[PDB]
Symmetry: C2
Subunit: 197 residues, 2 copies
């Protein structure tokens, strides 16, 4: 049977391929169709019956099954700047992801509460991986979730006013019937079987 997934974009790109590798590896010839996007768009997709499973970010309201999956944390990245305080004075441009989720407002709030000022809006982008690439090309600094980071060329954790890392969840949503279907069960399996680490 054919598994129809809706995955948030950064998840689709960075976390899911190891998941799908093992899923393909123990279930040869099993079909997978994958749509990606903003959590909001994939939630809306899931709701309207287009997919079996949604892998959504944030805190989606959902009246079916919802599995917490994981949590990651916000990092400021730049090629030059090594000290997060420096960004208050920086003239290096700020490369901001903005969508309809809370991501953007969370960062605006952290910034307002950390530096007692507004961040300069210069570069606005609508997808997170683009912000990452533009940061990796030295254009400016970005704030990315650690699920999108590796041994790439400076990463500085965001901590709130009480020294706590911020702060973002990934869930697995779906209605009951989907979890009745088998390949969904083998996929949820592979996920929870993988996460054993």
């Amino acid at each position: 049977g054919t598994l129809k997934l809706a995955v948030a974009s950064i998840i689709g790109q960075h976390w899911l391929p190891k998941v799908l590798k093992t899923y393909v590896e123990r279930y040869p010839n099993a079909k997978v169709s994958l749509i990606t996007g903003w959590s909001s768009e994939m939630l809306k997709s899931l709701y309207e019956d287009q997919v079996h499973i949604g892998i959504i970010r944030g805190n989606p309201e959902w009246k079916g099954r919802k599995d917490y999956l994981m949590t990651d944390h916000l990092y400021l990245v730049d090629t030059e700047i090594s000290c997060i305080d420096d960004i208050a004075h920086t003239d290096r441009p700020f490369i901001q992801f903005k969508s309809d989720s809370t991501y953007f407002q969370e960062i605006q709030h952290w910034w307002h509460q950390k530096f007692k000022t507004s961040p300069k809006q210069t570069i606005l982008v609508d997808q997170i991986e683009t912000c990452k690439q533009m940061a990796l090309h030295g254009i400016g600094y970005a704030i990315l979730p650690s699920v999108t980071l590796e041994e790439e060329d400076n990463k500085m954790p965001l901590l709130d006013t009480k020294d706590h890392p911020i702060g973002r969840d990934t869930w697995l949503l779906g209605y009951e019937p989907a979890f009745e279907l088998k390949q969904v069960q083998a996929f949820v399996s592979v996920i929870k079987d993988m996460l054993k680490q």
Copy 2:
């Protein structure tokens, strides 16, 4: 002030950073607002005056200014397979990108013509970078435009029945009023400078 761009995804990821790096290097503190996506979506967004400039792949019809930018060529990539004839038997999955552009149709047509059979619709993905990533993780093989490839990690040129590389074009689009703006002209300048490299 404030350039509003709409850019096909792989361009946004792989080619545009270079260009924005220079655009910023040359005009510090110039505001840039970027949206990304399928070529059809970015053309729509441009058609509706939501942006200044669109960068669009394929062969868009356009009753305004259209500049050809570049061509790139299709490669079959896989971690195991070295020889592109084998792909007709391998039973490794074909990770296949599919949108409402003609990318998919054109690869289908090539497949049918070259191998005289059909390809196995197992994995279907809605963004190209995810095919790349899924291919880089050994899941299966992918057909990717070279604008998304580097000295990476096994690539075999797609050639039509008369041994000519199969290509895809990328264009820059706008209506005349946009091209009168100093920031659109500066951006276009950085672009037409960069194409000589």
